[PDB]
Amino acid sequence: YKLICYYTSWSQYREGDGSCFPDAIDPFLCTHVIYSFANISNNEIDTWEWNDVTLYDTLNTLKNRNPKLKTLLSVGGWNFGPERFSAIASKTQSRRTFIKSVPPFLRTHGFDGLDLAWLYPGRRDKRHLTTLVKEMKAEFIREAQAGTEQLLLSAAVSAGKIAIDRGYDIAQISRHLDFISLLTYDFHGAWRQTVGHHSPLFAGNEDASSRFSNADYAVSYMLRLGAPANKLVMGIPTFGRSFTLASSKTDVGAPVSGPGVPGRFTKEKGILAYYEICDFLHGATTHRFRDQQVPYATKGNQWVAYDDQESVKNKARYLKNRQLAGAMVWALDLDDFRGTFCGQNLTFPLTSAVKDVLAEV
Ligand SMILES: CC(=O)N[C@@H]1[C@@H](O)[C@H](O[C@@H]2O[C@H](CO)[C@@H](O[C@H]3O[C@H](CO)[C@@H](O[C@@H]4O[C@H](CO)[C@@H](O[C@@H]5O[C@H](CO)[C@@H](O[C@@H]6O[C@H](CO)[C@@H](O)[C@H](O)[C@H]6NC(C)=O)[C@H](O)[C@H]5NC(C)=O)[C@H](O)[C@H]4NC(C)=O)[C@H](O)[C@H]3NC(C)=O)[C@H](O)[C@H]2NC(C)=O)[C@@H](CO)O[C@@H]1O
Numbered sequence: 519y520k521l522i523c524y525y526t527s528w529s530q531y532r533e534g535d536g537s538c539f540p541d542a543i544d545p546f547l548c549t550h551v552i553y554s555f556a557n558i559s560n561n562e563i564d565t566w567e568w569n570d571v572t573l574y575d576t577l578n579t580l581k582n583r584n585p586k587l588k589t590l591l592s593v594g595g596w597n598f599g600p601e602r603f604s605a606i607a608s609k610t611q612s613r614r615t616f617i618k619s620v621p622p623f624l625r626t627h628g629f630d631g632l633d634l635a636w637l638y639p640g641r642r643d644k645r646h647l648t649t650l651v652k653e654m655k656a657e658f659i660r661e662a663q664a665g666t667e668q669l670l671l672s673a674a675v676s677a678g679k680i681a682i683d684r685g686y687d688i689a690q691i692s693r694h695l696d697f698i699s700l701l702t703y704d705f706h707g708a709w710r711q712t713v714g715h716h717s718p719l720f721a722g723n724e725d726a727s728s729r730f731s732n733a734d735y736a737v738s739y740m741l742r743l744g745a746p747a748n749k750l751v752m753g754i755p756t757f758g759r760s761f762t763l764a765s766s767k768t769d770v771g772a773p774v775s776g777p778g779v780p781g782r783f784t785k786e787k788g789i790l791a792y793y794e795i796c797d798f799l800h801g802a803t804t805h806r807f808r809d810q811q812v813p814y815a816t817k818g819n820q821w822v823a824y825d826d827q828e829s830v831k832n833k834a835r836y837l838k839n840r841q842l843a844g845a846m847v848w849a850l851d852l853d854d855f856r857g858t859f860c861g862q863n864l865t866f867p868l869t870s871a872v873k874d875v876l877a878e879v
């Protein structure tokens with residue numbers, strides 16, 4: 519089983535305990551650690567933060583303590599304009615330019631692979647996405663001839679039915695990619711005036727209608743479309759999405775005024791880190807959708823949809839039962855990495871819970 523974990527570039531800037539640097543990562547926790555995100559300048563991959571080469575270096579030293587650990591650099595991300603990927607990929611010339619610039623960059627900074635996070639490809643992009651993947655892999659195969667271990671190519675893919683149908687030729691890119699990370703956690707939060715969980719495992723017979731917005735459907739779909747199970751990796755969130763209630767109602771379908779109040783450390787309306795959620799639970803009412811098998815909490819007028827050790831162990835069992843390649847976690851720096859916010863003294867409680875199930879039979 520693979521355990522793919524993302525570490526974000528911008529987490530170093532959070533104040534106090536929220537600050538997270540690469541050396542806080544347990545080397546033996548995941549099998550693959552992906553650094554987010556790289557930029558693209560002059561059609562070449564490039565750094566993003568002023569100190570990335572130092573952090574790249576700190577992250578890759580982890581391999582001195584654990585030789586089996588693989589690291590990858592991810593390009594793209596939500597805040598990355600998909601138009602930019604679109605323009606680079608639709609022109610054979612700028613596409614070859616970006617592709618050719620990737621291996622030397624990865625080899626200089628000690629990475630073992632590239633992760634593609636184009637979010638998201640439209641109907642007019644499908645054909646070019648397939649090309650970027652093909653040519654990128656061909657180039658990695660070419661590059662291994664020099665006697666080095668071949669570079670890995672992976673991609674983070676939307677788990678939304680319409681998004682998949684619209685921009686991805688799953689059967690094609692599946693044969694060229696080493697693994698595919700299913701983003702099974704942004705199903706409900708897309709500013710949509712009402713309450714709901716963003717990462718349910720199952721559909722649940724109540725208020726069913728977007729029968730497609732749950733992990734079980736997304737996995738089943740990807741498999742029907744042609745992706746091999748041994749290359750699929752299910753995404754497991756380490757954060758929660760919050761809402762500000764518009765009334766005293768707390769059950770499903772309850773109206774919402776907008777996103778939740780920022781977290782003290784993450785300072786971003788709408789989301790909370792697992793460690794902030796831990797603090798938040800004191801004096802809150804915790805509920806759990808049986809059908810969807812995920813929890814939520816309320817306090818005053820705030821409503822939070824999140825994942826705990828139990829829902830995360832549950833998802834890991836599901837994933838083993840369908841024989842997938844493993845799990846993907848977003849993100850290490852949103853988990854209780856210091857291990858001093860959630861109680862039972864454990865560093866990375868959520869990710870460790872996923873690791874324990876995977877390590878079981
Ligand atoms: C919200 C929503 O609806 N979107 C979701 C998507 O998120 C989702 O995408 C996938 O799933 C992840 C979670 O859903 C998703 O989220 C993450 O993506 C973006 C980036 O792509 C993250 O954006 C953060 O936002 C930060 C602000 O909150 C911002 O922080 C600022 O960062 C800069 C530098 O990075 C700091 O500047 C530096 O400051 C110091 C001094 O302070 C100086 O010394 C430096 O020189 C400064 N200069 C610079 C520029 O370096 C600044 O301090 C800091 N603070 C501020 C002002 O707040 C980050 O920069 C920015 N990151 C980027 C790259 O833009 C989101 O926060 C992430 N969300 C969560 C949650 O973590 C991923 O993109 C994606 N994952 C995968 C697998 O790819 C999609 C579904 O895919 O669904 C929705 O669209």
Ligand SMILES: *[C@@H]1O[C@H](CO)[C@@H](O[C@H]2O[C@H](CO)[C@@H](O[C@@H]3O[C@H](CO)[C@@H](O[C@@H]4O[C@H](CO)[C@@H](O)[C@H](O)[C@@H]4O)[C@H](O)[C@@H]3O)[C@H](O)[C@H]2NC(C)=O)[C@H](O)[C@H]1NC(C)=O
Nearest residue numbers: 556557558559560561562563564565566567568599601602
């Ligand atoms: C990620 O890579 C991106 C490049 O592909 C890059 O985004 C930008 O990259 C350039 C660097 O800033 C931008 O260039 C500038 O654009 C402005 C026009 O608005 C021009 O005029 C001015 O320049 C003045 C100083 O010289 C400044 O005071 C003014 O405010 C004004 O900006 C500049 O001369 C310059 O050309 C690119 O336009 C932009 N790329 C795209 C496609 O939009 C990011 O910088 C890079 N790293 C990150 C985001 O961390």
